[PDB]
């Protein structure tokens, strides 16, 4: 699939992407992958740039309102329930939400992990990195989505 | 009455068999059948000559515009 291949490519290149830096609402106009210079990007913009590399375009800045009405996603699990046993059924490339008000999102990777940027709020200098799901499982909020390209337009 | 005439004409256009010319005499007799006294006369602009249909042609679609004098 497209989303699984993109997640695998991001995982393979995760250690070379240290130029990318964390910010609250970093919306730079320069593509991070097409420039050796450091750049502050958040998770939403990161996903946008990652999907823009191929033929899909989506829209910018791709805020939380994107998932409501654009019809690019179909929900897998709803918000408000949180089961630890049904995490194994997930698949790579599923988007993982975080926070009580959709503050941050993530991309799921196998072996019970996820890819996201975590750091102090006021523009942290920590680069992108992968963390275990055990400590962040409290703030998962049970919302899960998935991509679909064949039928759209 | 305009809408009723449009619907009657469009319905006449449907339920028509294959390989028959677009005869106008039967059309005008069919639309005058609704009321002989109320309806006075009917005329046409371009289809005054019968349109010969081929063996594999059926006259079913068609947009109707009523132009009352």
């Amino acid at each position: 699939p497209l989303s699984t291949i993109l997640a695998l490519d991001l995982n393979d290149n995760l250690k070379s992407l240290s130029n990318i830096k964390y910010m609250f609402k970093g919306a730079p106009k320069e593509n991070p992958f097409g420039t050796d210079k450091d750049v502050y990007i958040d998770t939403y913009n990161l996903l946008y740039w990652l999907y823009l590399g191929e033929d899909e375009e989506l829209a910018y800045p791709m805020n939380i309102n994107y998932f409501f009405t654009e019809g690019r996603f179909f929900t897998i699990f709803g918000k408000g329930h949180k089961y630890k046993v049904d995490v194994s059924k997930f698949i790579v490339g599923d988007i993982l939400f975080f926070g009580r008000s959709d503050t941050n999102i993530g991309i799921y990777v196998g072996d019970g992990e996820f890819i996201s940027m975590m750091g102090k709020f006021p523009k942290d200098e920590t680069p992108i990195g992968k963390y275990k799901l055990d400590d962040y499982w409290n703030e998962f909020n049970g919302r899960v989505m998935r991509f679909d390209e064949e039928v759209y337009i | 009455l305009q809408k009723h005439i449009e619907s009657v004409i469009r319905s006449y256009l449907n339920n028509l068999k294959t390989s028959d010319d677009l005869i106008i005499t039967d059309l005008i007799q069919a639309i005058m059948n609704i009321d002989d006294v109320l309806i006075y006369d009917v005329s046409f602009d371009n289809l005054d000559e019968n349109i010969i249909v081929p063996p594999q042609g059926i006259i079913r679609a068609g947009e109707i515009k009523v132009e009352l004098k």
Partner: protein, 261 residues
């Protein structure tokens, strides 16, 4: 027999009389028309309309519940006027179970309406659970104006005004984006309370920017001298801010002004 031929009803024999005329219980109705001057509505039964006599509005109508009402020792009357809506379902209780004696007890919404005006995603769960307390405990309310007011058992609290303007507060670092001012600040669509239950944004009714002000004044104080200090915290629609202190009788003023530029 011959004498049995009287008013009767039911499969079992029952003397129908002036007891059957009296209604037993409470019934529902819809608000068709409201008397705005007296704030007494007339409710419609499925094929009958209650209240609604020759009396226009004052001398006959159906009373509506009030939050509280009374009079002060000075004599001045105080109370509330809760919003009244047409086409809402209202529960009615007749006095002494007499038809032609209606009163409205409360206003109950439809299942769809209730499902639309709540942001709680939980299907169910005991209220005593800590996690369920985060979402269940939410005094969520929406004014007649589509800008809403929100409170919660957590420290989050959100209030909205005309256009996309809002006031918010919170303490958890997790919730820090909801009430942050980094760069341009948090957008109105980032707040999860700003959406209806069916994945729809709560549009404000009025998109034009408001203009606020906090005017302060009095009459006198314990010193006995007349009060004549006036101060304001006016905010314009173009973003200006003006904090001013004024003494009108002495014709003196000191202003701190901020321009939109």
């Amino acid at each position: 027999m011959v004498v049995r031929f009287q008013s009767s009803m039911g499969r079992s024999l029952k003397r129908v009389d002036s007891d059957d005329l009296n209604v037993k219980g409470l019934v529902l109705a819809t608000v068709s028309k409201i008397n705005y001057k007296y704030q007494s509505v007339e409710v419609k039964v499925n094929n009958l309309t209650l209240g609604s006599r020759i009396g226009d509005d004052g001398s006959l109508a159906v009373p509506y519940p009030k939050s509280f009402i009374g009079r002060t020792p000075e004599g001045s009357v105080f109370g509330t006027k809760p919003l009244i809506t047409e086409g809402s379902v209202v529960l009615i209780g007749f006095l002494n179970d007499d038809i032609n004696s209606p009163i409205i007890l409360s206003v109950y919404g439809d299942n769809e309406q209730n499902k639309m005006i709540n942001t709680n995603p939980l299907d169910g769960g005991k209220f005593d659970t800590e996690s369920v307390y985060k979402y269940s405990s939410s005094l969520y309310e929406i004014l007649p104006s589509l800008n809403y007011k929100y409170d919660d058992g957590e420290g989050t609290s959100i209030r909205t005004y005309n256009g996309k303007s809002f006031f918010s507060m919170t303490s958890g670092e997790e919730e820090k984006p909801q009430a942050t001012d980094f760069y341009t600040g948090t957008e109105y669509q980032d707040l999860f309370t700003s959406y209806y239950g069916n994945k729809t944004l709560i549009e404000p009714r009025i998109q034009k920017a408001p203009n606020m002000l906090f005017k302060h004044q009095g009459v006198f104080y314990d010193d006995g001298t007349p009060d004549n200090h006036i101060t304001t915290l006016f905010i314009s629609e173009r973003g200006d801010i003006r904090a001013s202190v004024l003494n009108t009788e002495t014709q003196k003023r000191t202003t701190q002004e901020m321009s939109s530029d």
